[PDB]
Design a protein around this ligand. Sequence first.
Ligand SMILES: CCCCCCCCCO[C@@H]1O[C@H](CO)[C@@H](O)[C@H](O)[C@H]1O
Ligand SMILES: CCCCCCCCCO[C@@H]1O[C@H](CO)[C@@H](O)[C@H](O)[C@H]1O
Ligand SMILES: CCCCCCCCCO[C@H]1O[C@@H](CO)[C@H](O)[C@@H](O)[C@@H]1O
Ligand SMILES: Cc1ncc(C[n+]2csc(CCO)c2C)c(N)n1
Length: 176
Amino acid sequence: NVRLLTEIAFMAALAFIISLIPNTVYGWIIVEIACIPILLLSLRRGLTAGLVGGLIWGILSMITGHAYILSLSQAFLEYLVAPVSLGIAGLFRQKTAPLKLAPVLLGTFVAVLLKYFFHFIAGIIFWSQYAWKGWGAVAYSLAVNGISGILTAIAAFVILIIFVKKFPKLFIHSNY
Ligand SMILES: CCCCCCCCCO[C@@H]1O[C@H](CO)[C@@H](O)[C@H](O)[C@H]1O
Ligand SMILES: CCCCCCCCCO[C@@H]1O[C@H](CO)[C@@H](O)[C@H](O)[C@H]1O
Ligand SMILES: CCCCCCCCCO[C@H]1O[C@@H](CO)[C@H](O)[C@@H](O)[C@@H]1O
Ligand SMILES: Cc1ncc(C[n+]2csc(CCO)c2C)c(N)n1
């Protein structure tokens, strides 16, 4: 009870602190390293924990003034649904030894793809006034959010491979 809750809370606060690190490549093409703590949380504690972690992270972003909000529905999509959706990594939780790297990677792939799918949808609806010269709404959003999603996946792969090799205990919960 108290262990699980403190972990959800610490991973959400860490996601938020990490989102203060400058992460822009160009305009909205970004490297979203703040996903990582929520991915770690979901992989270790499962679907529900991760969902709740992402929800808390999203709320922190909004209530501290760090979220970019264009409307109620845009905020719902990009700062509730999108961060929550990272919890899908938890379907790839490993409960028993030995820890394999592949599930970690697949979970991450799927979770980051899902998050950036929601950003892609939002890009079409809410951000198309910024589209580059000659680019339609769909094309612009696919580029921006596709690229960000790939870069974010990259960063998550690199960090999580390091954690697997150097801190494998992180990925498997044990009582005792
Ligand atoms: C549910 C658990 C919640 C724990 C979250 C506590 C950590 C959040 C602190 O954020 C701070 O917000 C300030 C706004 O006043 C910013 O100026 C500052 O840069 C930033 O560091
Ligand atoms: C692509 C989005 C939806 C796909 C969700 C399907 C995931 C199936 C997860 O079951 C698997 O069960 C094993 C035994 O428990 C785990 O050890 C393993 O790591 C886990 O991967
Ligand atoms: C991080 C990169 C973001 C991924 C963007 C890829 C979008 C691919 C959409 O998947 C799809 O699902 C089915 C129902 O949703 C649709 O019938 C199908 O036509 C659609 O293409
Ligand atoms: C084309 C386009 N431009 C901006 C955004 C907005 N956006 C992208 S990632 C993100 C969350 C990072 O905190 C937000 C709000 C978008 N979806 N698509």
